[PDB]
Amino acid sequence: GFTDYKVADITLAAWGRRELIIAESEMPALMGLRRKYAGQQPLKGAKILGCIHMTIQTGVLIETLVALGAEVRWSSCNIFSTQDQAAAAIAAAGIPVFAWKGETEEEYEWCIEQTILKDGQPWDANMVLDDGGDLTEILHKKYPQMLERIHGITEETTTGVHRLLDMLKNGTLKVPAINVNDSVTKSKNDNKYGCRHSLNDAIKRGTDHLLSGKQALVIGYGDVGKGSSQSLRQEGMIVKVAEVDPICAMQACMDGFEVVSPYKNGINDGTEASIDAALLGKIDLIVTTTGNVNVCDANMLKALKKRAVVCNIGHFDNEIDTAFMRKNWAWEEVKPQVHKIHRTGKDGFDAHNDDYLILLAEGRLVNLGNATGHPSRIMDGSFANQVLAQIHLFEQKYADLPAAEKAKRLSVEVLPKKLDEEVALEMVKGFGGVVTQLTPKQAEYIGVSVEGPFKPDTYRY
Amino acid sequence: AGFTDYKVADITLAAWGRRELIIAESEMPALMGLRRKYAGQQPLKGAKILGCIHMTIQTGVLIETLVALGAEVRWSSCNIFSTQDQAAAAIAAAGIPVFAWKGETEEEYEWCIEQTILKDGQPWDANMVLDDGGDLTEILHKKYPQMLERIHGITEETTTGVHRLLDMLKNGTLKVPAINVNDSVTKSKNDNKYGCRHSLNDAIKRGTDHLLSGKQALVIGYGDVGKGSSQSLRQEGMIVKVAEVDPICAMQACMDGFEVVSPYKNGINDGTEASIDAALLGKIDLIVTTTGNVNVCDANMLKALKKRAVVCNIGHFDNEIDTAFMRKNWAWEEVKPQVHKIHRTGKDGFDAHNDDYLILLAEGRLVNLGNATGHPSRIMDGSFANQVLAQIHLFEQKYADLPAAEKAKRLSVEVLPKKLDEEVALEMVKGFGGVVTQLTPKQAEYIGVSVEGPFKPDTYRY
Amino acid sequence: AGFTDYKVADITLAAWGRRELIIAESEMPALMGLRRKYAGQQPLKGAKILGCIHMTIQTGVLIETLVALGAEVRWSSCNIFSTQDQAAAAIAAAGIPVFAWKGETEEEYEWCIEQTILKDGQPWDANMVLDDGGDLTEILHKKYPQMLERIHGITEETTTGVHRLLDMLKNGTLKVPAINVNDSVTKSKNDNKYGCRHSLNDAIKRGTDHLLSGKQALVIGYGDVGKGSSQSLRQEGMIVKVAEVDPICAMQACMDGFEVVSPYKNGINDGTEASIDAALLGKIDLIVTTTGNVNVCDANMLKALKKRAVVCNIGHFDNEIDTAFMRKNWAWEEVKPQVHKIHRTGKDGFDAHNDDYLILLAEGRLVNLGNATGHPSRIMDGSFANQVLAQIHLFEQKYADLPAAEKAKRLSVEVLPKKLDEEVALEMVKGFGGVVTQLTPKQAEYIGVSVEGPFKPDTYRY
Amino acid sequence: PAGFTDYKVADITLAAWGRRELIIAESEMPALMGLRRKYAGQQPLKGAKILGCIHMTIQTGVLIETLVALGAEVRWSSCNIFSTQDQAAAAIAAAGIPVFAWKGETEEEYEWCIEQTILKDGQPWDANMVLDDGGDLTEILHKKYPQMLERIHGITEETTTGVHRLLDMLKNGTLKVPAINVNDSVTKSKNDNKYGCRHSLNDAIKRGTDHLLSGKQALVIGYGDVGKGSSQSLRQEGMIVKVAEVDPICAMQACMDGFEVVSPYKNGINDGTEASIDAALLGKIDLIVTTTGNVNVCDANMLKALKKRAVVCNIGHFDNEIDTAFMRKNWAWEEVKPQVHKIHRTGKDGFDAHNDDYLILLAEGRLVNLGNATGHPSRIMDGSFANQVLAQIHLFEQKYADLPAAEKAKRLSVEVLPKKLDEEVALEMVKGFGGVVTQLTPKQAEYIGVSVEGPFKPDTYRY
Ligand SMILES: NC(=O)c1ccc[n+]([C@@H]2O[C@H](COP(=O)([O-])OP(=O)(O)OC[C@H]3O[C@@H](n4cnc5c(N)ncnc54)[C@H](O)[C@@H]3O)[C@@H](O)[C@H]2O)c1
Ligand SMILES: NC(=O)c1ccc[n+]([C@@H]2O[C@H](COP(=O)([O-])OP(=O)(O)OC[C@H]3O[C@@H](n4cnc5c(N)ncnc54)[C@H](O)[C@@H]3O)[C@@H](O)[C@H]2O)c1
Ligand SMILES: NC(=O)c1ccc[n+]([C@@H]2O[C@H](COP(=O)([O-])OP(=O)(O)OC[C@H]3O[C@@H](n4cnc5c(N)ncnc54)[C@H](O)[C@@H]3O)[C@@H](O)[C@H]2O)c1
Ligand SMILES: NC(=O)c1ccc[n+]([C@@H]2O[C@H](COP(=O)([O-])OP(=O)(O)OC[C@H]3O[C@@H](n4cnc5c(N)ncnc54)[C@H](O)[C@@H]3O)[C@@H](O)[C@H]2O)c1
Ligand SMILES: Nc1ncnc2[nH]cnc12
Ligand SMILES: Nc1ncnc2[nH]cnc12
Ligand SMILES: [K+]
Ligand SMILES: [K+]
Ligand SMILES: [K+]
Ligand SMILES: [K+]
């Protein structure tokens, strides 16, 4: 009688299992890790606190961690991103998981606490896997004593890495961490091509709007912004791109996009007069991709074309000033995670009012909120890096080191390029691709081993 | 008039070249912005630069920016087919020593580099080097090592030349510090990729006028040049297959919508005819090498290619294709300059109506420069603004005058600071009419950057 | 008050459906412009329309447009999986007879059509027909020919339906005139092509959540639906191969950048397993049928497909794929509604971890409507504005009131005039914010058109 | 051969180069060469004497020698002053074929060349067939040599503009011989007109200016077949492309294809005033391309409002799409190189060499793909010219000029080739790509109501 969980509906487990079995066929790098390390059990004794979107993809990651010896206790890192049939299957396997689609902010916090506490006392955790830094922050701020037993953190996403680096700079980071985000088989696969697959997916499921022929403004052109812009452009949208980074802006120009600012001459002085009203008045869809704060602000929201769609695909919802919209405009739910925002005011609304905006997933990550996030064959790359990161930090056993040996290892690092390449090769084989093997003379000519790595650490791909 | 310190194909093309120089200047905002900003200061006063890079219209604007900031130069091209003769003529007519013409022989190529090095039979008093591929660098280190005692730095343009510098650094044979210009983001991620996107299909069309839509291409390599080359062909409607040895680059080719194949069964290049995937190669209409490696389109691949396939290389050196094998065994028929039919029916003579032939472009030399005009001005703007900033930094450092302990700390191969990379990019963006947004103080603090930048950690790959 | 003349899944979905109808109205300017232009004229007053077409949100706006113009209707869906239950619910809640739900049996499908034809157990006094695919038209001609004596015309939505109409016409068995709505340019080259571009990858993602970039697709057919489908997949990064029997369409596939291949060696389908290009099919991750033909993904093809490939159909009827062979021979595992794993290991049982299976979507029925929502409102706006114009025209012509001698002269299958096609297109373009230029009198004179149009001869193919 | 001087080309020594490129081009034109091999034994054009007027390119060389291989005699000229490839003209003259064509003709030289085909040894040639591209030869015959039309069996016209001119003459009863509309074969219109311009428009702009196109703003006037292909030529290079149209159906396609549809005039109303120009819009355009076959679609007021240093070019058949006459009258022309001019908007008399207020005009407004590059590639022209050959055989064998008046009345029309021949051309093109077309089963052919051999579509089908 396993009861150490809470999900939406355990009877969805059989359905979840069916989709997990399909997902395993789509994740050869991760399943290959199961075969390669099975006999060795390299995570035997590992006790992992996990906080990441409880999708079918995360389900295969969890079961890969367990198959190598680990115990885990899991939550989602977003209130809307759980696939309830995935949570159900994991719970039915006898794995502690606290997650469902549509949590409140209170339930979100309570779910993280259930992974941290077992039977009212702190679990004897020794590893952390995190996506966005929320679980990392709670441990450091509320349970700092637990971190004295934890060998490391493996952090998934750009926002989480930035938070780790601030703590390292401030001397407040307690354990070593691996920047999983900056593997090329993560950042240049997950962040870019994943959003390419799943952004227009989420908009279609939410609105069923034709995108071809319409005008879109993508805020930001990093890895997420690049993939988001392509998601829309390949559908036939006329895509404009905003950036604060001139190098990323240069790439947008060369990639065939027009680079614009919401503000006249790019200066955001906070006034309505600074808004390029003629530009915003033409935009049918705006997507924030920055990891920054308030990049679709109240003045932009006021100036947007009637019936434009507004959504965010960065990690946190504060990219869009939804607070302003909750205070001043009336919200009409169309269906879960789809709201019309009536700009006529808060005192009710005319059900036939034409002056509204459509917000997706209440500003939360739209690909996971209104669809299913990245597909398995893309998450294969990210989560293979996660398993390798867990094994690397666990086998180092930072918490057992003499104090005079910890300082050398208290760091935030990426995986070595050899691991990056190993993950990439299994992905390529998954597509049926054939990689050419260098001859000894060719390897000597370009100064590499036939085994790799094939690029210096400076290389940007 | 009075000035004879040059050798170009035809000085009377100078007015035409000057007309195209004036057009190019309006297409190169970052390079002309540096010209205006530093003209008053003359930061290159006293610089004597040996330059070796494709003598194009774009290089002309580079050359005249350096002279406008106070430098004297002596110039040659780094390839036998890449010079634009009207550009060379306009430079020589401006009183600037230049030795370069389209269609040099290998002996003439070496002689041109030597005419920059030597003035009146003696070594010039050079103190700065600008190189593209390392040929000039190599000649100075091997044949004129005494000149390097007075040279303050090398600014190297391209991936192949940077590799040669890093081997010398490791060995302790590099005599002066270098800036890796190639690895500025406004170079590698602009020039190497987007440049080849523009000029690869440009060169193939000028050489053959072949329709590319619906035909089969094989791109060897998926680095920056291979990425841009694959897009150049795919946007024209080619069905593009990609070969790689780097599984990460291979992964990118898959996600970008390409089928990743190897010329060899299971990727094993064992040097036998039986290793060739003859079925795959018998279906390819166009093969392009982009690797910077050697013999990636070998003799057995050439024997296996579909009849009348086009063969070209867009990497720096021609040994990516085994053209030596073709000269030894097959008959060459010139369609027109830099376009040869290579008849696989024998070495001596050919039937004018033979159908078993390949079309080689630029005799295997860099095809975008050999059969067209290379990258466009607005792209070379970024590369060449980096070159000017690099020359300024190394000339002002005055390495050759530093104490030994200082020399040891500065003898390195380095890239320009990210802040300068961003400033080049900002001028490129404004050239397109783009508008970059300014962070609020709160937004800048939130992501931990100055409002002025730099906006990314040095680890960032873009 | 006490309306019971309907059958839907869940009437409590009505409020949800009305919210989505109000949104759809803002996405359909051509259809809503018709509603506003003709509302006061009431041109369909007296019309009684039997409607058989996918009971989607978009059909809801069509239904309420006809009612707003004066008509009474009785409605059913033309496919067992295409209904959106919240749309059906909203239409029923408005007091409009509708018999439709997602997931009907074949028996329930026929029953729903009969409920539109019969009111209180007797033939309804219908006088207009709106059909999509010809199922209702066929049932009327075969089982209720006396009702056709009072019917003024049929307006037929789709390619397969038009072909069935033209077959009846040449056989002298068609009883009332029809308008071919499919072949308006704002239908055929909008709906059939761009609609499938939007909704094909949409449905595959909802059903499987499979990554498409980098995998291999085979599209059977390259008419309007095949053109749109191939783009739906190529824009996602698939490597797409195209099969055709029409050499002109195949020519377009080549020029559009696709490799044209055949499931059969040398294109010859002799019925044996030996004719299957097994090498080609063993590399295919996804096959899509787009033909309107029969058995174009046959049993031998299904046997040769790569393990875990996806199989789907986007033509009108499920007989493009030999799903009957698979029901007879292989074991079906339901993943979720309209998604089945078909285990090629045998008919009786299956191993839950067997790797030799195919994923069939929507049991071979129209996949864009079975696994997603079909075309989006702004595309269906053009199709359904054409339907409303066609209904008005045939109802106003009053064919059924003519003497036999006059009926014979007007019995035919026609398309709408180009001037109307253009006027629908103008409202669509305005919906995007586009601005159409007006010819000067001298420009109009020069190319031989009127300033207001039509702008092209009837032979123009666009 | 010895004694042959009945030609006029730039440089006869270019013939060997031209022959080398014709031999390559034959390997790229399977549909045309298959017709040459199919009909060689029969000589279906023995006795044909063809007046030909079409761009004297390498691709036209292959068409000319196919016609001669099937028995025809021909006398040839180009249909544009800038479109001839001099090595193609040289190879044809050296083969003993009369041709009067060189790149860079004056208007006087152009008309002289057409007359040299019409006249042989000072008298009208006894021609009996016409192959035309644009209708200029057809117009000269009807207006200046009408008596020659009494012996001519037909005209085979290549392009949209020429077909419009033919239909105008038919409507007014002024057309004297029947014609085949070669343009509206699907293997012509939806191959040549669209995909040809996709290949060759960005080709010509790069050769003329070597400008980066990616990231820049383009305005394409028209979205017919040429405008569709032109817009793709630019968009696939990374340009931001806006599209202007008077036809809302073509405008609808532009929207659905992912382009923003705009007008040079406020609210699309062209009242002739400067105030009607959307000056903000045209002030952002780096490249304008006209594709309409209409008159003055890039007018003087538009040219005054264009962004500084914008490129201006036309890819429709005639140069009057751009008001170049206004520019000749008011602005100073600085030649960069042949077929590339800087137009200085600072005045007529003289210009500053470093002036920044200029436009770049390509090919002096003439069809830019043929003027600044080589036009469509051989594998595309294969389809158009296979159609031309079939059209010539049909009209010559019909022998219109030999029919009694009543039989002529039934035949005096402008027609297209049957779909079955359209399909047979497409099939050879597909095979040239290595494509494999599937054969219907008898049951399938019966299911959709076609023959296993085709035709596979009704005549109404638009593809
Ligand atoms: N939803 C998903 O599936 C998913 C996947 C990966 C990452 N993410 C999240 O998306 C966010 C972005 O990640 P990334 O990897 O692209 O980071 P990134 O650093 O590569 O890119 C962010 C970009 O935003 C730009 N930017 C910042 N402030 C801006 C402003 N005010 N206006 C315009 N541009 C501005 C920066 O210049 C930068 O180029 C992070 O929060 C990350 O965690 C989400
Ligand atoms: N022609 C131009 O305009 C131009 C511009 C820039 C650079 N280049 C030259 O092009 C070359 C490539 O430059 P880059 O910046 O792309 O370098 P890069 O290192 O980024 O890319 C080269 C790629 O080739 C691959 N490779 C090596 N050997 C291979 C083999 N046998 N088979 C398949 N793939 C193989 C490597 O894995 C690598 O990804 C260099 O010689 C450079 O100097 C030319
Ligand atoms: N699902 C949708 O939303 C939707 C929309 C419009 C039409 N349709 C349906 O899709 C079908 C196709 O419509 P269309 O307008 O594209 O028709 P079409 O006539 O334009 O195209 C069908 C194509 O299939 C080809 N074909 C026929 N038999 C073939 C075979 N054995 N192998 C390969 N190709 C073959 C034909 O040559 C033709 O080009 C019809 O059933 C139509 O009713 C569906
Ligand atoms: N250069 C080449 O290689 C080449 C090839 C084929 C045809 N052509 C020529 O190009 C021209 C166009 O041919 P096509 O086949 O595209 O014809 P088309 O009829 O298909 O297209 C012309 C389009 O221009 C539009 N148009 C007319 N006036 C306009 C205006 N004022 N503003 C905007 N749009 C306007 C029309 O609505 C029409 O859609 C003809 O002169 C033809 O002979 C040139
Ligand atoms: N499907 C997914 N599962 C987990 N994390 C994700 N991030 C983006 N997509 C995801
Ligand atoms: N959404 C939709 N509604 C009705 N008919 C359709 N046909 C295709 N998509 C449709
Ligand atoms: K997913
Ligand atoms: K250039
Ligand atoms: K829909
Ligand atoms: K050509």
Distance B462 CA to ligand 7 centre (A): 25
- Please report where in the chains the tokens 């401006």 appear, as a residue: B94
Which chains pack against B, by 3+ Cβ pairs within 8 A?
A, C, D
Cis peptide before B454 (omega within 30 of 0): yes
Ligand nearest to the CA of residue D60, numbered in listed order:
10
Q: Label the pairing between strands B331-336 and D155-157.
A: unpaired
**Residue A186 among the catalytic residues:** yes
Q: Encode burial over D337-358: b for 16+ CB neighbours within 10 A, e otherwise.
A: eebbbbbbbeeeeebeeebeeb
Structural contact between residues B151 and B391, judged by C-beta atoms closer than 8 angstroms: no
**Residue C187 among the catalytic residues:** yes
Look up the CATH superfamily of D4-194+376-435: Adenosylhomocysteinase-like (3.40.50.1480)
Is ligand 6 within 6 A of the CB of residue C61? no
Cα separation, C50 vs C98, in Å, equals 10
Q: Which residue precedes each gap in chain A (C to N above 2.5 Å)?
A: none
**Residue D376 among the catalytic residues:** yes
Distance (Å) of CA D26 to CA B339, B381, C30, C299, D14: 17, 41, 51, 42, 19
Task: Name every residue whose Cβ is closer than 8 Å to that of residue A157 and which is 6 or more positions away in sequence.
Answer: A131, A132, A181, A315
Contact B213 C257 (CB under 8 A): yes
Of D437, D448, D463, which is closest to C293 when you measure between CB atoms?
D448
Cα separation, D343 vs D355, in Å, equals 10
* Closest residue by CA, ligand 2 atom 10: B315
SS3 call for A71: strand
- Of B225, B262, B387, the one to substitute when testing ligand 2's pocket (max ligand atoms within 8 A of C-beta) is B225
Which chain A residues are within 8 Å of D257, Cβ to Cβ? 212, 236
Q: Is B131 annotated for ligand binding?
A: no
Q: If you count them, how many residues does chain D have?
A: 463
Residue D130 pairs in a beta bridge with D51, D155
Cα separation, D99 vs D266, in Å, equals 48
Exp. method: X-ray
- CATH of the domain spanning B194-374: 3.40.50.720
Is ligand 2 within 6 A of the CB of residue B292? yes
SS3 call for C47: coil
Q: What are phi and psi of A49, to 5 degrees?
A: -85, 120
- Both structure tokens of D366: 């003439």
Q: What are phi and psi of B359, to 5 degrees?
A: -110, 115
Q: Encode burial over D149-168: b for 16+ CB neighbours within 10 A, e otherwise.
A: bebbbbbbbbbbbbbbbbbe
Cα separation, D391 vs D385, in Å, equals 9
Cα separation, C399 vs C404, in Å, equals 10
Which residues, chain by chain, have CB under 5 Å from ion ligand 9? A 208; C 373-374, 376
| Residues 272-291, chain D, touching C (beta carbon < 8 A) | 272
Which chain D residues are within 8 Å of A257, Cβ to Cβ? 215, 240
Catalytic residue among C102, C152, C187, C343: C187
- CATH of the domain spanning A193-373: 3.40.50.720
Of B214, B216, B257, which is closest to C237 when you measure between CB atoms?
B257
If we measure between CA atoms, which residue out of A87, D83, D292, A182 comes closest to residue C449? D292
Number of neighbours of residue C38 by Cβ within 10 angstroms:
18
Structural contact between residues D58 and D88, judged by C-beta atoms closer than 8 angstroms: yes
Contact A260 B434 (CB under 8 A): yes
Question: Which amino acid, C342?
Answer: I
**Using CB atoms within 10 A of its CB, is residue C114 exposed (0-12), middle (13-18) or buried (19+)?**
middle
- CATH of the domain spanning A2-192+374-433: 3.40.50.1480
Size of interface C-D (CB pairs under 8 A): 197
* Closest residue by CA, ligand 3 atom 37: C246
- Of B270, B291, B312, B367, the one to substitute when testing ligand 2's pocket (max ligand atoms within 8 A of C-beta) is B291
Distance (Å) of CA C172 to CA C97, C165, C169, C177, D450: 33, 11, 5, 12, 19
**Residue A191 among the catalytic residues:** yes
* Closest residue by CA, ligand 2 atom 5: B192
Is ligand 1 within 6 A of the CB of residue A189? no
CATH domain D195-375 topology: Rossmann fold (3.40.50)
Longest dimension (CA), chain B: 76
Which chain A residues are within 8 Å of B459, Cβ to Cβ? 182, 414
DSSP H helices, A281-416, are 298-303, 322-328, 366-370, 376-396
Contact B335 D212 (CB under 8 A): no
Task: Name every residue whose Cβ is closer than 8 Å to that of residue A402 and which is 6 or more positions away in sequence.
Answer: none
Which residues, chain by chain, have CB under 5 Å from ion ligand 7? A 372-373, 375; C 209
Q: If you count them, how many residues does chain A have?
A: 461
**Residue A350 among the catalytic residues:** no
Domain boundaries, given as residue ranges, for chain D:
4-194+376-435, 195-375
Q: Which residue precedes each gap in chain D (C to N above 2.5 Å)?
A: none
Give the DSSP letter of residue C265: G
Element (H, E) at C259: strand C259-260
If we measure between CA atoms, which residue out of B285, B86, B312 comes closest to residue B199? B312
**Residue D319 among the catalytic residues:** no
C194-374 matches C3-193+375-434 in CATH topology: yes
Long-range CB contact pairs, D163-171, < 8 A, 24+:
D163/D414, D164/C447, D164/C448, D164/D293, D165/D135, D165/D138, D165/D139, D166/D135, D166/D138, D166/D414, D167/C448, D167/D414, D168/C448, D169/D142, D170/D412, D170/D413, D170/D414
- Please report where in the chains the tokens 């939505």 appear, as a residue: C157
Is ligand 6 within 6 A of the CB of residue C59? yes
- Please report where in the chains the tokens 């789509």 appear, as a residue: A26
Of A334, A354, A376, which is closest to C19 when you measure between CB atoms?
A334
CATH class label, B3-193+375-434: alpha beta
Structural contact between residues A293 and A319, judged by C-beta atoms closer than 8 angstroms: yes
Q: Report how far Cα D203 is from the mean position of its chain's Cα atoms.
A: 16
Residue C358 pairs in a beta bridge with C342
Q: Resolution in A, one decimal?
A: 2.0
Number of neighbours of residue A212 by Cβ within 10 angstroms:
20
- Both structure tokens of C132: 């999509």
Distance from CA of C193 to the nearest CA of A (A): 12
Cα separation, B161 vs A416, in Å, equals 26
Which chain C residues are within 8 Å of B213, Cβ to Cβ? 254-257
Number of neighbours of residue B451 by Cβ within 10 angstroms:
13
Structural contact between residues A13 and A97, judged by C-beta atoms closer than 8 angstroms: no
